[PDB]
Amino acid sequence: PDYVFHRAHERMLFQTSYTLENNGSVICIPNNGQCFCLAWLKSNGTNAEKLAANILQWITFALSALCLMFYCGWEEIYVATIEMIKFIIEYFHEFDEPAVIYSSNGNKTVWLRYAEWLLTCPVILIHLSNLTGLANDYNKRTMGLLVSDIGGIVWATTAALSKGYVRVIFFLMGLCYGIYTFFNAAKVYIEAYHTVPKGRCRQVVTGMAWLFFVSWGMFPILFILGPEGFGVLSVYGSTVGHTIIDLMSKNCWGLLGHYLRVLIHEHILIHGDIRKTTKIEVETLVEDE
Amino acid sequence: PDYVFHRAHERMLFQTSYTLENNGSVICIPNNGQCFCLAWLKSNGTNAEKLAANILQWITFALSALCLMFYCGWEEIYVATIEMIKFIIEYFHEFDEPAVIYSSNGNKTVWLRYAEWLLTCPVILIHLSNLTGLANDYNKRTMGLLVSDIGGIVWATTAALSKGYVRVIFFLMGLCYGIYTFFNAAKVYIEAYHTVPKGRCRQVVTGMAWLFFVSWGMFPILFILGPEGFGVLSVYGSTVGHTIIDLMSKNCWGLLGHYLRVLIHEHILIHGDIRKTTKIEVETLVEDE
Ligand SMILES: *C/C=C(C)/C=C/C=C(C)/C=C/C1=C(C)CCCC1(C)C
Ligand SMILES: *C/C=C(C)/C=C/C=C(C)/C=C/C1=C(C)CCCC1(C)C
Ligand SMILES: [Zn+2]
Ligand SMILES: [Zn+2]
């Protein structure tokens, strides 16, 4: 349990024992083959934040667990599986390399976070490209949606690994990739709203859109606030924030998507698949001929 | 120029000055806020390998440059743009953090490499999903192709960042993702061969398949041979090997793909788009009605 044992075994992760010499101008270290850096030893945050972070992580785990049990809708169960495995990794080695990368420039990069984005964010966007769940076509801009998002994560990760101005450059690059994703994602939500049958289906689509842009928009904000930004948030506080928006973006958004797909399925089962062309061009599900 | 200046300015990257004390049981270091690790100071390889690596990198750069000039075929120019930007980054900061990640466990992980895979490999697979270049449909297993590949890169990167058995676990996980990609990719090449018109088009498809599986299969092999494996290859030697198969997988494969798409285009322009159903189900381009 990393929540209990990290302070104990972090001595084995890297060098934590050192002696200051010559009025603090010299650091002396056991020649034991371990890497050393004072930056790595700095606090992750307060105990209150640490506690708050640990609570929400259990909640997400149970949420993901119940959702998995509850659950083609392969995209919904895939992200839940990743989220579950993530907690298992968090539970035992949250601040152990390389779940946290302690690099030579002093940075502490949460690779666990960025690796998860790589696994779940493209899948979420694939779901977005097929909100109705009807085989087999996707939008014309799904490939562009996927490429812009993966790139954005690469730039965000690279920005986190960097410092100073090079961090700024790769952040701004991720930002450019980000506006491309959102504009494309928005056009997908718009068409979806007019593709689904009028009624409750159009409500959840509106709800999924709100859940999407709010939650996803919070991530670059937290980046700026976190240790990889201007350090107003601790790494414990950064964890709290990410967990909250992980809840919205993956768990809640996934439930609504599944719920939306169920409604579509029951509709087509009852009324048949009947399309009315709407002016881009959209084939809208209707009830009567 | 990192090829010339790295030995000079690596003093500013991390601590390179230290004194052994007490019969080599104590290392003493300037208290200057820099990270220290003997593992980081180890040689990248021989000058012969370094020279060989630097030559092939220029070649790829010129190759990518000429290909860009030479060049919807958006996927071909996207990887060439990335490859060009990659060289520019290589030229100035090849062994500077975080192009190389110097982590607290002593590892030297080539993030530049893995970040590039994230950017170019999904795009290559998207191209693979649309070898004919005809709008707008892709295969049924493209989403599975993309997800399996991204995951595999995540596990490979995680494996490189790790050591010992956890490195082995994430390698084997990437391996499982890998066989999924190859089996799916193979089925795409098979259908493609029977979809394209009989003649030269079926030759290049066979050639692209050979280029694909040989080049892509070499990457996990080089992982095992490299510093992230059993260290038979130096980091300079690892660079040489990757550059050679970067040539095949991105540049050469991209040319053949573009060439294939040109042949398809000229065929449909001359003979029209005429399909004959072949038994999965494939709509085969033919010349006569
Ligand atoms: C479930 C996890 C999700 C949905 C994570 C999403 C992450 C982003 C939308 C990240 C965005 C960016 C940064 C953190 C920094 C650079 C700018 C962005 C937009 C690429
Ligand atoms: C242009 C660059 C390319 C095509 C890179 C491809 C990289 C791979 C196919 C990597 C494969 C793997 C490892 C390096 C280790 C774990 C096993 C694999 C298959 C995921
Ligand atoms: Zn720990
Ligand atoms: Zn350098």
Author numbering:
A (entry chain A), B (entry chain A): 39 to 109, 118 to 325, 333 to 342
Which of the paper's sentences describe this entry?
One of the major families of such protein tools consists of microbial opsins, membrane proteins characterized by seven transmembrane helices that bind a chromophore, retinal, to a lysine residue of the protein through a protonated Schiff base linkage, RPSB3.
The atomistically designed structural model that created the blue-shifted spectrum was verified by solving the crystal structure of the C1C2GA mutant. As expected, the overall structure of C1C2GA at pH 7.0 is almost identical to that of C1C2WT at pH 6.0 (root mean squared deviation of 0.66 Å over all Cα atoms), except for the protonation states of titratable groups, the amino-terminal (N-terminal) segment, and the retinal-binding pocket. The space where the C17 methyl group resides in C1C2WT becomes occupied by the methyl group of the alanine residue introduced by the mutation, and instead the C17 methyl group occupies the pocket formed by the threonine to glycine mutation. The C5=C6–C7=C8 dihedral angle changes from 177.7° to −31.4° (counterclockwise, positive), and consequently the retinal configuration changes from 6-s-trans to 6-s-cis.
